[PDB]
Amino acid sequence: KETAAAKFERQHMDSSTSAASSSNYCNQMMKSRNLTKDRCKPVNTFVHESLADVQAVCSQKNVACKNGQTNCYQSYSTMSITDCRETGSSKYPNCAYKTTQANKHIIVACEGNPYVPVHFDASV
């Protein structure tokens, strides 16, 4: 069974590309990472940094999570990310997304032993 840490990697990690991300990127990635099976997942971010660098965020700036929990961490440096947002005309099963590349500080929730990212909270 898929661990929370593994689910985070599936939903949020894409170390393979530096940034770029073609206009097609989100359409392809949301589908291939299995985020379009149950529904069109409305909002999802992929991080283009090493797994070690993203895992390292769990020891960085402690900040409040959007849900009020205390286990979120903001990266000290900006990271290459791609936001995927479902378009207004997108209709399941044909999920359609706008692809937006940015360099921003990520905020992730961390849990477990080892203490690793399990949720992508925000970018700032």
Ligand SMILES: O=c1ccn([C@@H]2O[C@@H](CN3CCCCC3)[C@H](O)[C@H]2O)c(=O)[nH]1
């Ligand atoms: O900048 C982001 C922000 C959110 N997410 C996604 O949406 C988050 C939570 N969700 C958002 C609104 C509906 C109920 C709660 C998920 O934890 C995360 O997968 C991003 O991926 N990148």
